[PDB]
Amino acid sequence: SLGSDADSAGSLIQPMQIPGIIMPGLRRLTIRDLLAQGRTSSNALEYVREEVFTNNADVVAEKALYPESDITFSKQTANVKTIAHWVQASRQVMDDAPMLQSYINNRLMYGLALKEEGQLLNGDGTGDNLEGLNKVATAYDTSLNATGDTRADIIAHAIYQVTESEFSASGIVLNPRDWHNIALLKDNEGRYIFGGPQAFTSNIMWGLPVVPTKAQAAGTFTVGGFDMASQVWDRMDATVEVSREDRDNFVKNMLTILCEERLALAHYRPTAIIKGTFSS
Amino acid sequence: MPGLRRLTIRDLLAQGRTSSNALEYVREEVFTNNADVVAEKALYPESDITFSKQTANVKTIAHWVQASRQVMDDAPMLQSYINNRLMYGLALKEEGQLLNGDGTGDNLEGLNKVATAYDTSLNATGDTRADIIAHAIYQVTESEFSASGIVLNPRDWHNIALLKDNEGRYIFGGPQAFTSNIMWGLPVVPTKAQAAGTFTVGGFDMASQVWDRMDATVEVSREDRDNFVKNMLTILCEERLALAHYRPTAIIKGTFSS
Amino acid sequence: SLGSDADSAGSLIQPMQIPGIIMPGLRRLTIRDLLAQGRTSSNALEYVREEVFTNNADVVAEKALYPESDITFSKQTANVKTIAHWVQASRQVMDDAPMLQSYINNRLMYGLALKEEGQLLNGDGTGDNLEGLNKVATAYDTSLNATGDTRADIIAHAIYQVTESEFSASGIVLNPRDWHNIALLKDNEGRYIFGGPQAFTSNIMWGLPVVPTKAQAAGTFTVGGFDMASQVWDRMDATVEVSREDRDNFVKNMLTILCEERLALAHYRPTAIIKGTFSS
Amino acid sequence: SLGSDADSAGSLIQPMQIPGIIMPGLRRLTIRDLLAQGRTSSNALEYVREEVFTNNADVVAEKALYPESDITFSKQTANVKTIAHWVQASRQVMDDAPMLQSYINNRLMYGLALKEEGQLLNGDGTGDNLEGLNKVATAYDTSLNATGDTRADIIAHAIYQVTESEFSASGIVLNPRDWHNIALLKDNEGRYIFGGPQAFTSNIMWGLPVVPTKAQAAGTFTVGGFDMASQVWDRMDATVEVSREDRDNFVKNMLTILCEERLALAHYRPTAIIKGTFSS
Amino acid sequence: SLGSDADSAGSLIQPMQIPGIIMPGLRRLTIRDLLAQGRTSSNALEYVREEVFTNNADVVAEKALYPESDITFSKQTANVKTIAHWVQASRQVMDDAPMLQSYINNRLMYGLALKEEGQLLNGDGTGDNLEGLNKVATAYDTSLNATGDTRADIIAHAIYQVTESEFSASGIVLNPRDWHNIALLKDNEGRYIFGGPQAFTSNIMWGLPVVPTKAQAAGTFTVGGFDMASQVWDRMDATVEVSREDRDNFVKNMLTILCEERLALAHYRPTAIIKGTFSS
Amino acid sequence: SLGSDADSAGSLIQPMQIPGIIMPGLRRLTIRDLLAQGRTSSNALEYVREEVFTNNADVVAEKALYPESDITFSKQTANVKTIAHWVQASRQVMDDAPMLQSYINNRLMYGLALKEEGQLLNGDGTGDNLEGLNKVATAYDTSLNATGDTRADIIAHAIYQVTESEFSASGIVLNPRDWHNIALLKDNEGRYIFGGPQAFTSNIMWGLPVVPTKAQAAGTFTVGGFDMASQVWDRMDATVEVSREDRDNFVKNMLTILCEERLALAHYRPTAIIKGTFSS
Amino acid sequence: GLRRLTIRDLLAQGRTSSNALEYVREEVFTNSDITFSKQTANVKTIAHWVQASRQVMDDAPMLQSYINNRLMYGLALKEEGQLLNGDGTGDNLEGLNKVATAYDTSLNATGDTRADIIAHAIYQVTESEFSASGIVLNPRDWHNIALLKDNEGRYIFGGPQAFTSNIMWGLPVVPTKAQAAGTFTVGGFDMASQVWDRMDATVEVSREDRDNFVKNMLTILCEERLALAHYRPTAIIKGTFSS
């Protein structure tokens, strides 16, 4: 009998290829689009912020000596760092896969922009590592915690701590898993606070937009007025340049694709940022 | 005239028509992302990528019945009925594979087979059955994709839409009204195919696609084997399918602890 | 003294007559309106219903033996039964009272059609009786019950068991006293479940029409796809024919009135019908 | 000193007369306005109701005898009773008080019209006394009362009992006090069933009009389709006449004021009326 | 050193005067504006009310003697009382502070009008004291208080008792403090009955306007149809006169100020007014 | 390797200067904008308020002795005080940083105005300190506390205390932290009083606006009709003068900047302002 | 094809467009009330396959003409094989020996022969209020009948000169091989039980049935579906040869 196995027939019917490739899960970048964008052209940035304001204004009695108040200033600096990575491949492949080139670019960008968001959130500040939000951010005041408070109360408590800097909040950042267990909070009767199975609710909390990014650690969180509390300064937009002559690539018939970018983070009002830790 | 109902699964996935023996597609396997911070005049990080040629074969499903040609030609009304029964019966098994496909031999790679295991550590103390399904919807997000639908054993879904709070009220609408087939804004399809006690969730809308080679068609034959001699009639109902799994990470399978 | 007493002049005044006749509560006709209506011209018609479907459809390889599926069919016979009753009356009264017969006629239809429903529901199926729905219907799955269930919870379960026959549930049948009690249901907090204490909810439950007929025995319920499952076949419509000449009627100057009809109940799918008993 | 005391100068001035007599609470006339009103000119009314319909419709056997059904007719009667009363007074006072007569008239009418309701409700039926509703009304079925039922739950049951007779219930009657205690029911939660303290609830219950009248004794209720269950026939509308020459009146120089009214209460369908006692 | 001390030169600058006297709070007069008003010019008022109406109206048999009914009336009086007070001051303060009498005049009118309510409400009725409302008000029916009743639950009962008179209530008067503890009531869950903390509740209860007045003793309350319950008659509006020659005022160069008013309260229908006291 | 460390070549790139200075959190002032304002020209204010009104207007019998009523007036004074502070800086720095001057001026104002608010509330009222709103405010009635009351109940209770002067409360003042916990109040079921987490809660309570200010010490609160309870008087607006010859400034090359303001607070009706403390 | 006598021709021939039909029949007797018995009559089918080589079939067009007729006859032979003897299953039919009335032996006389006993069976046709029609026997038995003589050696039917065909006592005779040796049946068929034809005797060929283009074996099938209706079981009588 004429089957379809390699043994007999079947070596004629070629499987119809599916146009293009299957790109994996693309994390929704948001952190960048949260802070103010800046366009620099130098190596570093120097700014000045009022450090200590010793106010002694008081009720001075008649014909007496007035109070002497003092003020302090500091020069906080923000250095420019660089993020990038390269991937060398065979030119033999590139010539056969036309759309491969334009693809790899769409990847390295995501791959880079990912670590971009990664640093921004938790920058060590150690040497080359940037100084992320969860580094400078003022710690959550444990005093605000009361008897029997849901994880939701804590967040609300945080939003307040922001107001202690006379500045209004802009958004809330959490680990998707944590935010999940929150949307499922139930009252003493049974009903859901946000949900109610028949339909699902949006990512809003106390009028403030919620942003659940996997970049955030499981247990930690952040709240503040990002759209005015800090600014990201771009030196060089994410560019992708290719080289056919890179070192011994000419002799090996290979292209060395590169994707670089120069950034710099600035922390104006650190008092408007809060980093806490969920207890359980 | 016999009527049917909704509750479709084939409609839940991407439907495309083919005309070949199989489908060759490529997917990004292991992406070695090493992008990081780099000191001045230092050597940059090297990253790499991996690909695979995942193939999905075109299998065939069908069945037949041998009846008396006499009863058929004398009462042609029964003809159309029998046909519609097989069409319905086959379609039931169409889902049979899609859900629990052995993946081995001739059985297709069922969703449950390819599905990523449910996270056991998510179930908290004092959770209901709905709380679980909810957890699953999140598991999908771990793939960076929006969940599309939900599939469960009819008996299970039944005892679910009937849950009540401490006050006593019904969660999915009071008895005065009907109980819509939706959860958290997501459609739901209860089928016997799904085993009692198990469940499935994912972004079927674009996580996996079904490829139809030959639509379910029924054709009869007067002549065949015995037939002519035993004045029999062989009715056949066939359908050539092929299932492909693009993003397996976007599908979960678990079990209730009740 | 001249009074209105029968002894005195009270024999002169005649009480004012009131037209028409006070016809007792006319029950609302249902059931028959739920089933499919068909007409015949025979004494009976043998139908066939799908007994056992043996599905065996499975995947197969090339040069493979296709699977065989079997479907068992139960041959059932639908008999045409006859219902009626006669009334012997004085032909003298008929002449003295015009629209009397016009009344008696429209009175027997109700009397007859009453048993019409009385059979279709609780048909004994014993010889001269009809194979009633409850007699045919499959029993309720006592296993579907769960701790804490209410009366409503049960009916809900039934609607599901209908789906097991691969058929859409049509309506619900109950004894008024039961249905009434059901509507007046309360939660663990207090308030009513249907409409409220100010509005009596309509006859709709779980999105399906509810039919309360005294015909349905108390503590018994029936559910299914009536508008598609079983069909009723009419041989002779409800007709009334009278005759002065008959037995000794002509001699006693009597007139016997007759009202009859010929029905036939079909059951294409019992699985799609459930009957259970309310536990108290 | 001169004071307003009688023993002083007080007897000089006179108090300012206040035009108008102080009529007590004019009880809101109801019931009659509810019941279907008619009009006759005789002294009695006769109607006919189907007493007993002996239905025997059943399935028929092969070549056998048929069922014999029978019916009963009763000539229920309703007499025309007379209600009235008279007041006797001095013809002297009448001339010294113009508006007096015009007042008495407006009183006797209300006085008579009051006893009118009084009969329609609790009519002894004792010969002369009219056959009140509560007399003919079908007793409430006790076996309908469930466990843990509110006073409202009962009335709800009552409604149905009318439907058990195949009729349109339309109207509720009870002692104002009872209605009050009812409209103030609270759930195990606390909230008021018929609207919070914000506003007083309307006299609507279960989509049915509510009529709280003092006529109805405490712990007694009535339900039905009064707008069709019974009809009141008027023979003599309430009129007022006076005679100065009546017997003694002339010589005693008096005057007699008369106020008569010939009524007749008909009870077509008693089955459509219910009366019960409250479980206190 | 030349400061503003007393021992220094500070005793030169005179502080800026603030024209206008600081008149304390003014209790919003209400009572008087509630009930109907009018005026007379005599010493008392004699109105006529229907005392007893023996309605013996009943059913009468033919050729029988109709029932005899009788009526009764009683002339009720209403005495005109006087209320006032005087203030004695020196003319030395008057000529030196012109804008004084102009003040006191507009202060005594208030002072008097204040005690005006004091009588209208808790009117003793003994001796020359005016017969207030609470005194004449029909007692409260304690036989209405059920088990587990709220304070507002009681007031509701009162409103009903107005129907006992066959009239409609048009107001509810209570001590502000009591009313406060009422509006702040909550169910067995916590939710406020009169509205969530967001917005304050209006002075409405059971569709009837609420009137909080300090004139009402704490724990006491009143309900009725004032606009048709009782009318106030004025003999002389609030007047203010002064005398320098009053008694020994001349030989003391003092001045006596008077502020009198002649009132008279009449209670037409007392049955439509209820007074009571809270349990706690 | 020609890098940009510092010793290599980093000494060539000058950091991009960030225009302007980062000013800390700017506390939104409120208190001052709550009271009526008006300028003066003296150094003290005198007002006269009716202390005790001994009213005795009672009912008087005919030809009797009228009641004597007395009145009292007090001369309450209000002193003006001065608040300020100075800053000593190098004349060199000034000439090197232009905008500095304009900044300091704009910073001293806020610095001063801060204590302005700080005094108006917690004014010791002792030696030179102004008689702050709290020091004057009538103490809260401990008797207005019901069983199981939340902080939310108390605030409402306070509003009533204001009504004990016949005035309306203009607003509510308290420490932000305290108000925070209040906004997060839950009922016995566990739900939120002001708003579900999905939504945001406004800053109003019982129709009255709420004003949170750090100035208010934690655990304290104030309520009343401020708009006309007290008035602020400005002798001299907040101005800023500068001297280059202050003391030894011409020898040390220093420049002294001063920011002063002459304020005077008056308290008309104290009985319309309440202060209290939470006992949680 | 001149044929002989067909048992099929002995019954009234009608037509139908159904799969069956409910009839009515008599059973018990009394004279003057009678009794009945009512039931249905189902339609079955008859035929037989003929596996032959297409090779020779196309070598002669006029060949299939004969092949066809050879089957048309074999069809009738199998037809009469079940008409007399039928189980009553979905394949078989309700046979005559099932709806027959055994011979009343008491109608015998002393000094009778085989020729007398068959005429005795004719009288039993009278006790059904009907007339006689046909006679059926085994060819071998009938052969003995025609060759019968008396004690002296003389024929009954007469010499060879006197002879028409298959008749006896003015009634037709159909000696079929279907009737067992020593068995016989009689009745008034022309008016007793009749037959209705749904589909006439039509043949339909197939180049497909298991082995066709596998061996060039084209199988021919001569089919026909009819229906036998029984009205009077008393008008039928079956017996045996006692000697």
mmCIF file of N, CA and C in Angstrom, chain D residues 57-121:
data_model
loop_
_atom_site.group_PDB
_atom_site.id
_atom_site.type_symbol
_atom_site.label_atom_id
_atom_site.label_comp_id
_atom_site.label_asym_id
_atom_site.label_seq_id
_atom_site.Cartn_x
_atom_site.Cartn_y
_atom_site.Cartn_z
ATOM 1 N N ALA D 57 -65.939 12.883 33.698
ATOM 2 C CA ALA D 57 -65.204 12.623 32.465
ATOM 3 C C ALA D 57 -64.009 11.736 32.785
ATOM 4 N N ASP D 58 -63.886 10.631 32.058
ATOM 5 C CA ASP D 58 -62.791 9.692 32.271
ATOM 6 C C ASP D 58 -62.499 8.953 30.969
ATOM 7 N N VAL D 59 -61.443 8.143 30.972
ATOM 8 C CA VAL D 59 -61.068 7.370 29.794
ATOM 9 C C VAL D 59 -62.123 6.300 29.530
ATOM 10 N N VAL D 60 -62.353 6.000 28.256
ATOM 11 C CA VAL D 60 -63.352 5.009 27.881
ATOM 12 C C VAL D 60 -62.737 3.681 27.450
ATOM 13 N N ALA D 61 -63.412 2.592 27.805
ATOM 14 C CA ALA D 61 -62.968 1.250 27.454
ATOM 15 C C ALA D 61 -63.541 0.855 26.094
ATOM 16 N N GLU D 62 -63.148 -0.318 25.608
ATOM 17 C CA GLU D 62 -63.621 -0.812 24.319
ATOM 18 C C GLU D 62 -65.058 -1.319 24.411
ATOM 19 N N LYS D 63 -65.915 -0.804 23.531
ATOM 20 C CA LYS D 63 -67.327 -1.186 23.471
ATOM 21 C C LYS D 63 -67.980 -1.261 24.852
ATOM 22 N N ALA D 64 -67.801 -0.210 25.645
ATOM 23 C CA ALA D 64 -68.365 -0.169 26.986
ATOM 24 C C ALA D 64 -69.294 1.024 27.172
ATOM 25 N N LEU D 65 -69.856 1.135 28.373
ATOM 26 C CA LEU D 65 -70.755 2.231 28.709
ATOM 27 C C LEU D 65 -69.946 3.492 29.002
ATOM 28 N N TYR D 66 -70.593 4.647 28.873
ATOM 29 C CA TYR D 66 -69.941 5.926 29.122
ATOM 30 C C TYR D 66 -70.365 6.551 30.452
ATOM 31 N N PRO D 67 -69.520 7.438 31.009
ATOM 32 C CA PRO D 67 -69.764 8.131 32.279
ATOM 33 C C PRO D 67 -70.900 9.149 32.219
ATOM 34 N N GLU D 68 -71.708 9.187 33.275
ATOM 35 C CA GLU D 68 -72.822 10.123 33.355
ATOM 36 C C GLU D 68 -72.498 11.247 34.331
ATOM 37 N N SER D 69 -72.435 12.471 33.817
ATOM 38 C CA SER D 69 -72.152 13.641 34.641
ATOM 39 C C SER D 69 -73.442 14.426 34.863
ATOM 40 N N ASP D 70 -73.530 15.125 35.991
ATOM 41 C CA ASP D 70 -74.724 15.901 36.316
ATOM 42 C C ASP D 70 -74.365 17.278 36.876
ATOM 43 N N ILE D 71 -75.339 18.186 36.895
ATOM 44 C CA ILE D 71 -75.124 19.542 37.400
ATOM 45 C C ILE D 71 -76.277 20.005 38.295
ATOM 46 N N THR D 72 -75.982 20.951 39.183
ATOM 47 C CA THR D 72 -76.973 21.493 40.104
ATOM 48 C C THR D 72 -77.062 23.014 39.982
ATOM 49 N N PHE D 73 -78.277 23.540 40.104
ATOM 50 C CA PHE D 73 -78.516 24.976 40.023
ATOM 51 C C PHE D 73 -79.368 25.444 41.194
ATOM 52 N N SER D 74 -78.906 26.490 41.866
ATOM 53 C CA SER D 74 -79.623 27.046 43.005
ATOM 54 C C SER D 74 -80.075 28.473 42.723
ATOM 55 N N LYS D 75 -81.259 28.820 43.216
ATOM 56 C CA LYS D 75 -81.794 30.162 43.034
ATOM 57 C C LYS D 75 -81.553 30.968 44.307
ATOM 58 N N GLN D 76 -80.307 31.384 44.509
ATOM 59 C CA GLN D 76 -79.950 32.172 45.682
ATOM 60 C C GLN D 76 -80.621 33.539 45.606
ATOM 61 N N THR D 77 -81.203 33.962 46.724
ATOM 62 C CA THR D 77 -81.905 35.239 46.790
ATOM 63 C C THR D 77 -81.184 36.254 47.675
ATOM 64 N N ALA D 78 -81.511 37.529 47.472
ATOM 65 C CA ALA D 78 -80.929 38.627 48.234
ATOM 66 C C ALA D 78 -81.999 39.692 48.456
ATOM 67 N N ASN D 79 -82.395 39.872 49.713
ATOM 68 C CA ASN D 79 -83.423 40.846 50.072
ATOM 69 C C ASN D 79 -82.918 42.279 50.185
ATOM 70 N N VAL D 80 -83.851 43.221 50.087
ATOM 71 C CA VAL D 80 -83.552 44.644 50.190
ATOM 72 C C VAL D 80 -83.946 45.133 51.579
ATOM 73 N N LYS D 81 -82.947 45.417 52.406
ATOM 74 C CA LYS D 81 -83.189 45.895 53.763
ATOM 75 C C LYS D 81 -83.254 47.421 53.803
ATOM 76 N N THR D 82 -83.632 47.964 54.956
ATOM 77 C CA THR D 82 -83.745 49.410 55.123
ATOM 78 C C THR D 82 -83.004 49.901 56.362
ATOM 79 N N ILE D 83 -82.178 50.928 56.174
ATOM 80 C CA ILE D 83 -81.410 51.519 57.266
ATOM 81 C C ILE D 83 -81.790 52.983 57.416
ATOM 82 N N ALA D 84 -82.009 53.406 58.657
ATOM 83 C CA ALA D 84 -82.376 54.786 58.938
ATOM 84 C C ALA D 84 -82.447 55.081 60.428
ATOM 85 N N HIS D 85 -82.756 56.334 60.733
ATOM 86 C CA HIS D 85 -82.895 56.826 62.097
ATOM 87 C C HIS D 85 -83.442 58.245 62.041
ATOM 88 N N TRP D 86 -83.980 58.714 63.159
ATOM 89 C CA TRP D 86 -84.547 60.053 63.218
ATOM 90 C C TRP D 86 -84.158 60.791 64.484
ATOM 91 N N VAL D 87 -84.151 62.114 64.384
ATOM 92 C CA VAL D 87 -83.811 62.972 65.506
ATOM 93 C C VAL D 87 -84.987 63.900 65.778
ATOM 94 N N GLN D 88 -85.253 64.139 67.057
ATOM 95 C CA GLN D 88 -86.347 65.006 67.462
ATOM 96 C C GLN D 88 -85.756 66.220 68.171
ATOM 97 N N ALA D 89 -86.311 67.396 67.899
ATOM 98 C CA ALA D 89 -85.816 68.628 68.509
ATOM 99 C C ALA D 89 -86.887 69.706 68.612
ATOM 100 N N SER D 90 -86.551 70.783 69.314
ATOM 101 C CA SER D 90 -87.458 71.905 69.506
ATOM 102 C C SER D 90 -87.468 72.831 68.295
ATOM 103 N N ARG D 91 -88.669 73.140 67.815
ATOM 104 C CA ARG D 91 -88.859 74.021 66.664
ATOM 105 C C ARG D 91 -88.349 75.423 67.005
ATOM 106 N N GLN D 92 -88.252 75.701 68.305
ATOM 107 C CA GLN D 92 -87.779 76.984 68.816
ATOM 108 C C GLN D 92 -86.302 77.179 68.487
ATOM 109 N N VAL D 93 -85.493 76.190 68.861
ATOM 110 C CA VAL D 93 -84.052 76.216 68.623
ATOM 111 C C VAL D 93 -83.744 76.352 67.131
ATOM 112 N N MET D 94 -84.580 75.725 66.306
ATOM 113 C CA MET D 94 -84.422 75.748 64.855
ATOM 114 C C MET D 94 -84.515 77.138 64.237
ATOM 115 N N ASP D 95 -85.394 77.973 64.781
ATOM 116 C CA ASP D 95 -85.573 79.330 64.277
ATOM 117 C C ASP D 95 -84.488 80.278 64.781
ATOM 118 N N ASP D 96 -83.922 79.959 65.942
ATOM 119 C CA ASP D 96 -82.871 80.774 66.540
ATOM 120 C C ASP D 96 -81.487 80.414 66.001
ATOM 121 N N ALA D 97 -81.399 79.271 65.330
ATOM 122 C CA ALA D 97 -80.145 78.805 64.748
ATOM 123 C C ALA D 97 -80.396 78.398 63.299
ATOM 124 N N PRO D 98 -80.225 79.345 62.360
ATOM 125 C CA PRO D 98 -80.426 79.129 60.923
ATOM 126 C C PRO D 98 -79.653 77.940 60.352
ATOM 127 N N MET D 99 -78.326 78.034 60.391
ATOM 128 C CA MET D 99 -77.440 76.993 59.870
ATOM 129 C C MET D 99 -77.621 75.626 60.527
ATOM 130 N N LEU D 100 -78.256 75.607 61.697
ATOM 131 C CA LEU D 100 -78.486 74.374 62.446
ATOM 132 C C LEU D 100 -78.989 73.212 61.595
ATOM 133 N N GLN D 101 -80.123 73.407 60.930
ATOM 134 C CA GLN D 101 -80.703 72.366 60.091
ATOM 135 C C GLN D 101 -79.728 71.894 59.018
ATOM 136 N N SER D 102 -79.146 72.846 58.293
ATOM 137 C CA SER D 102 -78.182 72.540 57.237
ATOM 138 C C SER D 102 -77.027 71.703 57.782
ATOM 139 N N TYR D 103 -76.791 71.817 59.084
ATOM 140 C CA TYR D 103 -75.733 71.070 59.751
ATOM 141 C C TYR D 103 -76.197 69.648 60.034
ATOM 142 N N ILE D 104 -77.324 69.536 60.734
ATOM 143 C CA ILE D 104 -77.908 68.247 61.099
ATOM 144 C C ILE D 104 -77.997 67.325 59.891
ATOM 145 N N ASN D 105 -78.419 67.881 58.758
ATOM 146 C CA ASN D 105 -78.540 67.118 57.522
ATOM 147 C C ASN D 105 -77.194 66.486 57.184
ATOM 148 N N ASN D 106 -76.166 67.324 57.057
ATOM 149 C CA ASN D 106 -74.815 66.866 56.742
ATOM 150 C C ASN D 106 -74.285 65.844 57.745
ATOM 151 N N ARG D 107 -74.891 65.807 58.930
ATOM 152 C CA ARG D 107 -74.485 64.873 59.974
ATOM 153 C C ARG D 107 -75.150 63.514 59.829
ATOM 154 N N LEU D 108 -76.480 63.504 59.848
ATOM 155 C CA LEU D 108 -77.252 62.271 59.718
ATOM 156 C C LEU D 108 -76.812 61.447 58.521
ATOM 157 N N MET D 109 -76.436 62.132 57.444
ATOM 158 C CA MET D 109 -75.966 61.465 56.238
ATOM 159 C C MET D 109 -74.724 60.660 56.594
ATOM 160 N N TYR D 110 -73.728 61.340 57.162
ATOM 161 C CA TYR D 110 -72.488 60.699 57.579
ATOM 162 C C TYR D 110 -72.780 59.642 58.641
ATOM 163 N N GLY D 111 -73.719 59.948 59.534
ATOM 164 C CA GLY D 111 -74.092 59.018 60.583
ATOM 165 C C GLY D 111 -74.629 57.728 60.001
ATOM 166 N N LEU D 112 -75.588 57.854 59.088
ATOM 167 C CA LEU D 112 -76.191 56.703 58.427
ATOM 168 C C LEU D 112 -75.150 55.989 57.572
ATOM 169 N N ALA D 113 -74.490 56.747 56.698
ATOM 170 C CA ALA D 113 -73.465 56.215 55.803
ATOM 171 C C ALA D 113 -72.379 55.448 56.552
ATOM 172 N N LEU D 114 -72.257 55.709 57.850
ATOM 173 C CA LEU D 114 -71.267 55.029 58.673
ATOM 174 C C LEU D 114 -71.769 53.620 58.971
ATOM 175 N N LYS D 115 -73.010 53.518 59.443
ATOM 176 C CA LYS D 115 -73.607 52.220 59.744
ATOM 177 C C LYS D 115 -73.695 51.405 58.459
ATOM 178 N N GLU D 116 -73.722 52.107 57.326
ATOM 179 C CA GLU D 116 -73.776 51.472 56.015
ATOM 180 C C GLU D 116 -72.560 50.562 55.901
ATOM 181 N N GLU D 117 -71.373 51.129 56.110
ATOM 182 C CA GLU D 117 -70.134 50.358 56.061
ATOM 183 C C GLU D 117 -70.172 49.282 57.142
ATOM 184 N N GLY D 118 -70.595 49.680 58.341
ATOM 185 C CA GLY D 118 -70.681 48.766 59.469
ATOM 186 C C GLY D 118 -71.369 47.444 59.180
ATOM 187 N N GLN D 119 -72.398 47.476 58.339
ATOM 188 C CA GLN D 119 -73.131 46.269 57.976
ATOM 189 C C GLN D 119 -72.390 45.469 56.917
ATOM 190 N N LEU D 120 -72.000 46.151 55.842
ATOM 191 C CA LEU D 120 -71.280 45.539 54.731
ATOM 192 C C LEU D 120 -70.091 44.709 55.196
ATOM 193 N N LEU D 121 -69.531 45.077 56.344
ATOM 194 C CA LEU D 121 -68.392 44.365 56.897
ATOM 195 C C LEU D 121 -68.856 43.224 57.798
#
